Design a protein around this ligand. Structure first.
Ligand SMILES: Cc1cc2c(cc1C)N(C[C@H](O)[C@H](O)[C@H](O)COP(=O)(O)O)c1[nH]c(=O)[nH]c(=O)c1N2
Ligand SMILES: Cc1cc2c(cc1C)N(C[C@H](O)[C@H](O)[C@H](O)COP(=O)(O)O)c1[nH]c(=O)[nH]c(=O)c1N2
Ligand SMILES: Cc1cc2c(cc1C)N(C[C@H](O)[C@H](O)[C@H](O)COP(=O)(O)O)c1[nH]c(=O)[nH]c(=O)c1N2
Ligand SMILES: Cc1cc2c(cc1C)N(C[C@H](O)[C@H](O)[C@H](O)COP(=O)(O)O)c1[nH]c(=O)[nH]c(=O)c1N2
Ligand SMILES: Cc1cc2c(cc1C)N(C[C@H](O)[C@H](O)[C@H](O)COP(=O)(O)O)c1[nH]c(=O)[nH]c(=O)c1N2
Ligand SMILES: Cc1cc2c(cc1C)N(C[C@H](O)[C@H](O)[C@H](O)COP(=O)(O)O)c1[nH]c(=O)[nH]c(=O)c1N2
Ligand SMILES: Cc1cc2c(cc1C)N(C[C@H](O)[C@H](O)[C@H](O)COP(=O)(O)O)c1[nH]c(=O)[nH]c(=O)c1N2
Ligand SMILES: Cc1cc2c(cc1C)N(C[C@H](O)[C@H](O)[C@H](O)COP(=O)(O)O)c1[nH]c(=O)[nH]c(=O)c1N2
Ligand SMILES: C=C(C)CCOP(=O)(O)O
Ligand SMILES: C=C(C)CCOP(=O)(O)O
Ligand SMILES: C=C(C)CCOP(=O)(O)O
Ligand SMILES: C=C(C)CCOP(=O)(O)O
Ligand SMILES: C=C(C)CCOP(=O)(O)O
Ligand SMILES: C=C(C)CCOP(=O)(O)O
Ligand SMILES: C=C(C)CCOP(=O)(O)O
Ligand SMILES: C=C(C)CCOP(=O)(O)O
Ligand code: NA
Ligand code: NA
Ligand code: NA
Ligand code: NA
Ligand code: NA
Ligand code: NA
Ligand code: NA
Ligand code: NA
Lengths: 208, 208, 208, 208, 208, 208, 208, 208
C-alpha cells in the first residue's frame, strides 16, 4: 500500500468536527489502522456541531466508532488522555503518522512549546522528535501573531500546517464537498489514496 | 453609522471568489462606498468558480457590479491595476478601510515585502503606513513557512490576518452558510453591522 | 470636533523650524490646546533658520507665541525642559497627542532607548506607555543604520515616523507650499482638519 | 524506477542554458515526464549562449523540444508563464520534483519571498508548501548578502541550493565535462540514475 | 577628476521628479557619463509634476535629454527597462556609481529583496554584489515599518539611504533651493564637486 | 599625501590621556589639520594622569595645544562641546576622518545608540551616516556584555574598534613604547605614515 | 598602477586548483607581489587535478613557482602554514589584498568563526580586522545551510564571496575559457587589469 | 583563604607573555595551586617577547617554572596539550578557576564555538558547563566583529572578558607597572588578594 499503515488521529476542540469524522471514515475505508484520541473540549464541539452521540469512555467510544465507520475488529484503537501505556506516547512505538484535526489554538500552542500535558500533546512531541509525519489542521479566524508564531515554529521543524480552509476551484455544491476538500488535502499530504479531489491539470498537455 | 464609510475591496487570485462577491454585496447593503480592485488572476478565478460574467475593463466592470449588487450610482468605484490617480494609491486620500478577499499567497508576499507593483499592493502599503485598517483573507493549505512568516510580519504590524476558514459551530447547512460565516467575521473586524452570525453567548448569564 | 483636543508639540534641534511653527499656527487655528516644548538646540536652529525672535524663558516664550499665533489666553502652554509638574510628564495626565517636529536624531535616539533625560523625552516615553499618539518628524540625510534602527523600533511600537520629506505631486510653487505639505500630513495623521493638501483622487470615479 | 516519475524543469535567466538543456536531455533518456517552463529572460539567455533556435510559443516550443531530445509523444509538456491550469500551479496535482536550472537571482528572490508572480514562481511555492523536492541552481558571482540570505532561507526550509559550480576532481577535458558534472549532481540529488559522474571512492576499501 | 566617471541614474515612481532632473543636469555639467534609466511610473510622475515632455522610447528619450541638458554626444546613454545587454545589468561592466532618485517604496522593496524584475532593479543588485556605490533617494511619509526594515537592510549592506528631506539651515528662498540641497548631498556622497551647498563651518576656527 | 588631510580627534573620559596627546603630536608632525574636541571628564582624566595643564576654554586651549605640539597657526582647531557651528556637526562639512581616543564606555554607548548629546557624539553620528572613517579607542577591563554589544553594533556598521591594548612583540622598554604601539595602529588604520611600528615580516621572504 | 601592489593568495582544499594557478599566473604578469600560501589538502587536490608537481617545502615550492610563472626574483613569496613571522600574520604588516582560491568549506568555516588555526586562517582574520580586501572562492554543491550561514556572515562583514561559478554568456569553448572567467572576476574585484573578460555592454549606447 | 585554591592558567599565542608570567608569579606567592597549560604558539611568543628559556616538554617545563617562581614542590602542575587524564579535562575534577592569559583570537574562537581541540580548549569548555570561573585576557587591535561576537557570546554565558588594556590612572612609570595593572584586575576578578592596585576611592568619604 501507499502511505502509512497506522495513523494517530487526534481531535481537539476547534470547530470542524465534521473534518475529523470524515477523515476517520476515509482512513478506515483505506484499510488503515487508526489510533484515535479526542480531547474533552473536542467532545463538546462534536455534540454542538453534529448529531453523533459519541460515548465518553474510551472503550464504549471504541465500540461506537467501529460500528459508525464500518471498521474491522481492532482497526480503530481508542486511547484515553492520560494513557501513557499507549503506543503514541513513546518513540519506541511502531511508526505512525499523526494528524490533529481539528487542531485548537490551545493544542497548537502546547505542541509548539512542548507542553506534553496529555496523550495528544505527548504524541505530537514524539512525532516531532522521531521526525514522523505530523499534520495540524487549525480552524481559527483571525489568526493572531501568537497563533502565527506557533504555526511558523512547527512548520520550520517539519510539521505540516494545513488549515481548514477549503478551496472552491471545483465548484463545491454542499458542505460535504468543502469538508471533503480539506480531508483530501490531508490524505494527499500523508500519501494515502483519495478520489474526492482530482489531480489538478493532469490532462493538461500544453498551454492554450 | 458604525464602521468605516469607505472600504477598499481588493480581490486577488486565491480560491474563494464567492467570499469577495458576498462581502461586496453586504457592504453595498450597509450603504458603504466601495473602491473595488481586482487582479488579472482573480478574474480567472471568478470565471472558474462562479457563473458571474465580469467585464474586463474597469468602466464596464463598474456598470456590471452596480447592477449585480443593486448599488446606487457612484457607490461602487472600480479602479484599474495601474491607476495611480485613484484614492487608494496615496495616504493623502480620504481614509478607507481595506480588505483583500481572497488574498493570494502572491499578494500576501507583495504586501509583506512592500512590492507596490500594482494598485492593490500600493493601496495595502498605504494602509499600513497610515495605520488604516487592513484585513487579509488568505485561502491556502498547507501554509508553508514562507506564507506563515509573511502573515506573521503583517500581523505584527497591525494587519488582520483572517483566513478563509469558516466555523461550523452554528451547524451550517449550505455552502452559502460557510461563505457567510467568513464574511460576517470580516464585517465584525471592520465594525460594520451584520446579522448572519449571532453574537456568541449574548444570552448566556451564568454557567450551567 | 475631530482629532485630539490637546497636542503636545515638541520642537527639537533638527533643521526645519518652519515646519514646527507652521504646525503650531495650524493647531491654534483649529482651536486646539497646545502644550509647547522646545529644546536648547532647537532654539538655536530657530534663530539660524528664521527671523522669529523667540524669548528663552517659558513665560516670556508663552506670551510671545500667544501673540505670534493669535492664540487665545491659555491656549498655548509652555513648559520648561525639567518641569516634571507639567501634564506631559505623567500618564495620569489628561490624554494628549504628541508631535516632535522637527525631531533631531538625538531625540529620536533618546525616545527609542527610553532615556527620559528631559521633559520632551519623558513626554514621548509616556505617550508610548499609555499608547497615546506619538508622531516623530525627523530631518536628516543620509539616514544611517543607527537612525533607521531607532525609527524601526519606534514604528514597531506604534509611533508614526513621518520624515520631513515633502511631496511634489501638487506642483509646489514656494517653500511655504512644501512646508505646508508636511504639516498637512501631520494633521491628517492626527485626524485634525486641514485644507492645504487635497484628498487625493476624491473626484476620481473609474479608471480612464 | 528510482527517483521521481515527473520533474518540473524551469529555466530562468541566469547564465548556463547548457545546464538546463543537458538536464532535460538526461531526464528524457531516463524516461521521465518533464513539465517544462522557461522565462522570457531565459529565452534571451538561450539565444545568446547557444545555437538552439527555441520557438517562443509553448506549443511550437513543445514540438521543438520533443524532436531536439528524441522524446516520446507527451513526455515533455510545455506550459506558459501564466497557465494556472497547469499541474505545477496547485498542490493537488500529482507529485513532481522541481528543478530551477539555471536559477536567476531574481527567481531566487521571488521563491524566497513567495512572490508567485508567474507559473515558475508559483510552482516553487507549491513545492515548498507540499514538501516536494525543490532544487535551485543559481549562477552568480560574487554572491551578495541579499543572494546569500535568500539561499539560506530556502535551504532552511528544505530546498536544495545547488550552485552551478562544477568540480574538477575527475580532470575535465571539455566544457561538456563541466556541464555534465553539475547535471550529474542534480540527478544524484533527485535520486535519478546517471553515469556521467562516478561514485567517489566506491572501490576504496581501506586507507593507503 | 574627483568621483566616479560614470553614474547610473535611475528614476522611479516616487514624487520628486525635479530632484532627478536637477541631478542629471549637475552630472552633465561635471562632464560625467550618465547611464539613464526610468520606470513607467516615473514617466507618469514626471508628466504630473513638471512641464518636461519626455519621449517614451529610449532613443527619442536620449535625444531629448541630450538637448535638454546641453550634454555632449554619447554623454547620456538611455537604456530600456528590459535591456539586459546594457552595462548596468552585469558586474563585468565598467564600474559605475548608481543613484536611484527618486526611489519609490516599490523599488526600495525590490532592491532589498533582490527581485531584479527590470534593469533598474538588476542594476542595483549588481551594484550591491560588486560593492559599487548605490544611493537610494526615497520620498515617502510616513515611513512604515516595511519601508524602514527595507532601508535598514540595505544600509547595513553598504547602500546610502538618502531621503529627499532638504535642510533649511542656509535659509532657502525657493523650491529650487530645496531641490538643490538634496542634489548637493547626493553629489557629496558620490565625491563629485558641487557649489550649491557650502562646506559647513569651513571658516570656523575656534568656538565663540 | 597619504591618508586624510583633516582628522577630528575627540578625547573622552577613559583612562589613557597619553594616547590622545601622542596621537595629536603625531598628526601635527604629519602636517594634518586636527579638529580637537575634549569632554569634561577627559579634562579631569588628563589632570589626573599627566602634568599637562590644559586650559578649560576652547580658545585658551587652542593656543596651549598649538604651542605644546609645535603646530602651525590654524593647524589645530578646538571646538566646544555644544558648538554646532563647527564642521564636525554636519555631513555637509569637508570630509574628515574621526578618532575618539580614549573612548569612554559612556561615549561608546552614546555613539552606538545615536544619542548626539554633544559635539563629540554628533560628530561620530555624522561620520557613520556619511560613511567617513570612525576609529574608537576604548580603555576598559573587564568588558561587560553591554560594552561588547555596543562595540559589535558599531563594528558591523563600519567603525574601527581599536582598544588600547598595546602589543609586546617588539620588546617594549618603556611606557612610551606601549603608548606609541597603540598610536601607530591608529595611524596605520587611517593610512597616515608612521615609523614607530615596523611593517611586520616585510624582510621575510620564505619560511625558515 | 591600479589595484593592490601585494596579494596574499591562499589555496585551500576545494576542487579547482586550476583557478588558483591561473590567478597566480595573471597576478605575476601584472607585476604584483604575491604572498603564496597553500594547505596540505590543497596540495593533494593539485596532485589529483593537475600535472603540476609542486614541491612540498616552502623554499623548494618558491623556486618551482617562480620558474613555473616566469616570475621575477622575490616576486612570489611562499610561507609555511605555521610561519607567524610572515607578513600576513599581523595587521602591522604592509597592506595586502587577500584571495582564498579555491576556498574549502573548512576554510570558509574557520574564517567565519575566527579559528586562526594556521597562517591562511590567521591571515584572513587579519584582513577582516584591518578592513583589507578579502575574497573567498568556494567550490561546493549543494551548499548546505552551514555553508550559507558562514558565507552570509562574512559577506555582511565585507568579505567578497565569489563562488567558482563561471558564466557562459561569452560562449566558452574550452575548460580554460571557464577558468579564465572566474579569474577575471577575481581580478575585477581587486581592481587589477585583465583582458580575458570584456566589459559588458561597453559599446552599447541606447536600447534596440 | 580568599579566592580559589586552584587556578588553571593557560597561556595562548597572543602577545603579552609578560602578563601570564607575572600572573603565575603572583598566584604562586599567594600559595595557590596552579595547573599550567601553554600552547605551541604561546611558546613562540614567549621566546620572541622575553628572555625566559622555557623548556618544551611538560616535565622539564614544570621543573623550570617551579624554580623560576620559587614555587613549592607540586604547587605548579604542567599538563600537555593532549593530556586528557589531567584534572582540567573533566568536570568531575576538583573545582578550579580558569584564566587564559594571554588569550589569542584563535583560542577565543575555539572557546566560543566549543571546539575542544586541545586541553586548553576542553578545559574552558568544562569551566563553562560546570559554571566555574573562566577569565579570558585577549590582546588584539582592532577587534573585528568576529572577535566581538565571540567575546559577547562568552560574556553572556558568564565568562569574564578582561582585555589586556592597562589603565593609567595611577601614573604608571614602567612597563612593569602596566603589566601589574592587568594582573591585579585578574586577581581582583578571582577574589585573590593583591597589593599592586589600590582600592579606588577607599579613603574618599564625601564629595569635594
Ligand atoms: C463549540 C466550541 C467551538 C469552539 C471552541 C470550543 C467550543 C466548545 N474552541 C475553544 C477550544 O475548545 C478551547 O480553547 C479548549 O481549551 C481547547 O482545548 P483542547 O485543545 O481541545 O484540549 C475553539 N478553539 C479554536 O481554536 N478554534 C475554534 O474554532 C473553536 N471553536
Ligand atoms: C482557478 C485558480 C485557483 C487558484 C489560483 C489560480 C487560479 C487560476 N491560485 C494561484 C494564483 O492566482 C497565482 O499565484 C497568481 O499569481 C496570484 O496573482 P494575484 O495575487 O492575484 O495578482 C491560488 N493562489 C492562492 O494563494 N490560493 C488559491 O487557493 C489559489 N487557487
Ligand atoms: C543650525 C543647526 C542645524 C542642525 C542641527 C543643529 C543646528 C544648530 N542639528 C544637530 C542637533 O541640533 C544636535 O545633535 C542636538 O544635540 C540635538 O539636541 P536636541 O535633540 O534638540 O535636544 C541637526 N540634527 C538633526 O538631527 N538634523 C538636522 O537637520 C540638524 N541640523
Ligand atoms: C545574456 C544574459 C545573461 C545573464 C542575465 C541576463 C541575460 C540576458 N542575467 C539577468 C537576468 O536574466 C535578469 O535579472 C532577469 O530579470 C531574470 O528574470 P527571470 O528570473 O528569468 O524571470 C543573469 N542573472 C543571474 O542571476 N545570473 C546570470 O548569470 C545572469 N546572466
Ligand atoms: C503622481 C504620482 C506620485 C506618486 C506615486 C505615483 C504617481 C503616479 N507613487 C506610487 C508609485 O509610483 C507606485 O507604487 C509604482 O508602483 C512605483 O513603481 P516603480 O518603482 O517606479 O517601478 C509614489 N511612490 C512613492 O514611493 N512615493 C511617492 O511620493 C509617490 N508618489
Ligand atoms: C581619572 C578617571 C579615570 C577613568 C574615568 C574617569 C576618571 C575621572 N572613567 C569614567 C568616565 O570618565 C565617566 O564614565 C564619564 O561619564 C565619561 O564621560 P565622557 O564620555 O568623557 O563624556 C573611565 N571610563 C572608561 O570607560 N574607562 C576608563 O578607564 C575610565 N577611567
Ligand atoms: C581531491 C579532493 C577534492 C576535494 C576535497 C579534497 C580532495 C582531496 N575537498 C575536501 C577538503 O580538502 C577537506 O575538507 C579539507 O579538510 C580542507 O582543508 P583545508 O581547508 O584545505 O585546510 C573539497 N572541499 C570543498 O570544500 N570543496 C571541494 O570541491 C572539495 N573537493
Ligand atoms: C610573536 C607572535 C605574536 C602574536 C601572534 C603570534 C606570534 C608568533 N599571534 C598569532 C597567534 O599566535 C596565532 O593565531 C595562533 O594560531 C594562536 O594559536 P593558539 O591559540 O595559541 O593555540 C597573535 N594572536 C592574537 O590573537 N594576538 C596577538 O597579539 C598575537 N601576536
Ligand atoms: C515509554 C514512554 C511512555 C515514553 C518514553 O518514550 P521515549 O521518550 O521515546 O523513550
Ligand atoms: C500621490 C500618489 C499617487 C502617491 C503619493 O502618496 P503619499 O505617499 O501618501 O504622499
Ligand atoms: C507624576 C509624574 C511627574 C510621573 C509619574 O507618572 P506615571 O509614570 O505615569 O505614574
Ligand atoms: C488550483 C490552483 C491553480 C491553485 C490552488 O492550488 P492549492 O493551493 O494547492 O489548493
Ligand atoms: C551578462 C549579464 C547581462 C548578467 C551577468 O552578469 P554577472 O552576474 O555579473 O556575471
Ligand atoms: C548643519 C548642522 C549643524 C547639522 C546638519 O547637518 P546634516 O545632518 O548633515 O544635513
Ligand atoms: C605579530 C604577529 C605575528 C600577530 C600580531 O599582529 P596584530 O594582531 O595585528 O597586532
Ligand atoms: C573524563 C574526561 C577526561 C572527560 C569527561 O568529563 P565530563 O564531561 O565532565 O563527565
Ligand atoms: Na505538564
Ligand atoms: Na515594482
Ligand atoms: Na537620565
Ligand atoms: Na504578484
Ligand atoms: Na522576476
Ligand atoms: Na539629547
Ligand atoms: Na587554534
Ligand atoms: Na576537534
Amino acid at each position: 500500500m501507499s502511505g502509512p499503515e497506522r495513523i494517530t488521529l487526534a481531535m481537539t476542540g476547534a470547530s470542524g468536527a465534521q473534518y475529523g469524522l470524515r477523515l476517520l471514515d476515509c482512513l478506515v475505508q483505506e484499510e488503515r489502522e487508526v489510533h484515535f484520541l479526542i480531547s474533552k473540549a473536542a467532545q463538546l464541539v462534536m455534540a454542538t456541531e453534529t448529531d453523533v452521540a459519541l460515548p465518553a469512555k474510551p472503550q464504549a467510544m471504541q465500540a461506537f466508532l467501529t460500528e459508525y465507520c464500518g471498521a474491522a475488529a481492532g482497526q480503530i484503537r481508542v486511547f484515553g488522555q492520560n494513557d501513557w501505556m499507549a503506543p503514541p506516547a513513546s518513540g519506541s512505538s511502531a511508526p505512525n503518522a499523526m494528524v490533529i484535526c481539528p487542531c485548537s489554538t490551545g493544542t497548537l500552542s502546547a505542541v509548539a512549546t512542548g507542553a506534553c500535558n496529555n496523550l495528544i500533546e505527548r504524541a505530537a512531541d514524539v512525532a516531532l522528535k522521531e521526525r514522523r509525519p505530523l499534520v495540524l489542521v487549525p480552524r481559527e479566524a483571525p489568526f493572531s501573531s501568537i497563533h502565527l508564531e506557533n504555526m511558523l515554529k512547527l512548520s520550520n521543524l517539519g510539521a505540516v500546517i494545513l488549515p481548514a480552509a477549503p478551496g472552491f476551484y471545483h465548484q463545491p455544491q454542499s458542505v460535504e464537498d468543502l469538508v471533503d476538500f480539506v480531508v483530501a488535502r490531508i490524505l494527499n499530504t500523508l500519501g494515502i489514496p483519495q478520489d474526492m479531489l482530482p489531480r489538478w491539470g493532469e490532462q493538461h498537455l500544453v498551454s492554450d
